[PDB]
């Protein structure tokens, strides 16, 4: 359940996307599967992603709701159901403001937390700002709101949240509608405080939530804002003081100290946030309290490359480390971002370029919550 209000900020750096194209399950001819294109680490959020089949666009492509990581960079999963055959070739095309031309990537065949993420993007001339809100318990999304969608309601995105009655959905719809109007104002006062033109597109990002240990007791609370992918104002760990980044955010900080906004958030993050996280963990215990250990294997392909795989694991937190002769090798190694399979599980792999013949000197180390002991892989 969300915080009841969005306090007004008050009047007074681009990153290119990382692209991964992959199937949900290991590719098998004649077997139904899912083709994924995962884009992450990009800013701003406006992005155009196509899935290509034999040199043309696949028609029915869905994508996840816009969310972002701790560093404020966005991520999206584009996916479609498909049956790969022997001759068909697939790829993903991504267009972004950071790219001079669209990039094509071919398909080479027990702690807990509750998090709410908000993104507001101004569209000068092309309508009102785009507002997207998502709610997470750990790495499982359970609610969403899109200002461009037809329902104009907060919608369920996990089976266990559908239980909640109309008073829940009406209340979350009411709150998220007000948050949209608040950030529409916020974009205006930020444009004014920074003396920016009315024709430019800008982004307000908001994130808050609480962490609990394996005993379901409060650990940490968060509440931070960002303007155009840069820190604006953030609530410190004590949940009593604010960190302002510049003169514009200092004005917001003084208005929030005078209004005692931190005290409102502290009670929510230590009380309501914890209370409903436990209710969600209980109601969706079959999904949220599971742990899927990574199914691991090793791939080999003057020099040779060693690739350490980890598949179908939950939660997404994982560590893959390379080392030669028991010495952590943080050089000549490729580590991709953890990616969603689309079925609730996650994937990751680690690469290392080894001189041919010295392959058995390298070892891949896998740390995950579902593993009783950390694993060691070696060819």
């Amino acid at each position: 359940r969300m915080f009841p209000n969005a306090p007004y900020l008050g009047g007074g750096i681009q990153r290119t996307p990382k692209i991964q194209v992959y199937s949900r399950h290991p590719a098998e001819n004649g077997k139904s599967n899912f083709l994924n294109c995962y884009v992450s680490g990009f800013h701003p959020s406006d992005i155009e992603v196509d899935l290509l089949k034999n040199g043309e666009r696949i028609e029915k492509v869905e994508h996840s709701d816009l969310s972002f990581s701790k560093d404020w960079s966005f991520y999206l999963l584009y996916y479609t159901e498909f049956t790969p055959t022997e001759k068909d070739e697939y790829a993903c095309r991504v267009n972004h403001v950071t790219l001079s031309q669209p990039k094509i990537v071919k398909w080479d065949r027990g702690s807990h937390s509750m998090r709410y993420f908000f993104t507001s993007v101004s569209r000068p001339g092309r309508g009102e700002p785009r507002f997207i809100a998502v709610g997470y318990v750990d790495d499982t999304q359970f609610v969403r709101f899109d200002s461009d969608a037809a329902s104009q309601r907060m919608e369920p995105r996990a089976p266990w949240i559908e239980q909640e009655g109309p008073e829940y959905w009406d209340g979350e719809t009411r709150k998220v509608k007000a948050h949209s109007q608040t950030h529409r104002v916020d974009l205006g006062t930020l444009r004014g405080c920074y003396n920016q033109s009315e024709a430019g597109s800008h982004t307000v990002q908001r994130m808050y939530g609480c962490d609990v240990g394996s005993d379901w007791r409060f650990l940490r609370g968060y509440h931070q804002y960002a303007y155009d992918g840069k820190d604006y104002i953030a609530l410190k760990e004590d949940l009593r003081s604010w960190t302002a980044a510049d003169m514009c955010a200092q004005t917001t900080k003084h208005k929030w100290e005078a209004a005692h906004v931190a005290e409102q958030l502290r009670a929510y993050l230590e009380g309501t946030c914890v209370e409903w996280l436990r209710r969600y963990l209980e109601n969706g215990k079959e999904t949220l309290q599971r742990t899927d250990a990574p199914k691991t294997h090793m791939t080999h392909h003057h020099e040779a490359t060693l690739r350490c795989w980890a598949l179908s694991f939950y939660p997404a937190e994982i560590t893959l480390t390379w080392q030669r002769d028991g010495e952590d090798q943080t050089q000549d190694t490729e580590l991709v971002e953890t990616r969603p399979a689309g079925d609730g599980t996650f994937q990751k792999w680690a690469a290392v370029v080894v001189p041919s013949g010295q392959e058995q000197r390298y070892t891949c180390h896998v740390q995950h919550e579902g593993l009783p002991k950390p694993l060691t892989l070696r060819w």
């Epitope: 034999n54 040199g55 043309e56 669209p102």
Partner: nanobody, 113 residues
């Protein structure tokens, strides 16, 4: 391997119209989707069409621009009606092979007074 010959650009008054054409040289089995992007750093989708005739348009040109194809000559056409000053850009023809290799033309300047 593949060459894209572009033509039909130039200067036009507001409200006027132009027709771009793009011809792919090589085998007819070498190119599926053909279309246009236009320069803004990035280049934005204008319109493209598959060999089977599946079209897609950028939001800023929907209703005014129309792409068509003569599959018997591997050549596409872009009828750009109701042109505005904001339509001024270099328009790059492009094509996709059936293995998802992209080919790009040098582009044609379009200027709307």
């Amino acid at each position: 391997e593949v060459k894209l010959v572009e033509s039909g650009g130039g200067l036009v008054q507001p409200g006027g119209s132009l027709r771009l054409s793009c011809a792919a040289s090589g085998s007819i089995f070498s190119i599926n989707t053909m279309g246009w992007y236009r320069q803004t750093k990035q280049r934005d989708l204008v319109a493209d069409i598959s060999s089977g005739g599946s079209t897609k348009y950028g939001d800023s040109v929907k209703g005014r621009f129309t792409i068509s194809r003569d599959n018997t000559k591997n050549t596409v056409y872009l009828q750009m009606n109701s042109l505005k000053p904001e339509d001024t850009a270099v328009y790059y023809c492009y094509g996709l092979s059936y293995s998802n290799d992209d080919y790009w033309g040098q582009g044609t300047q379009v200027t709307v007074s």
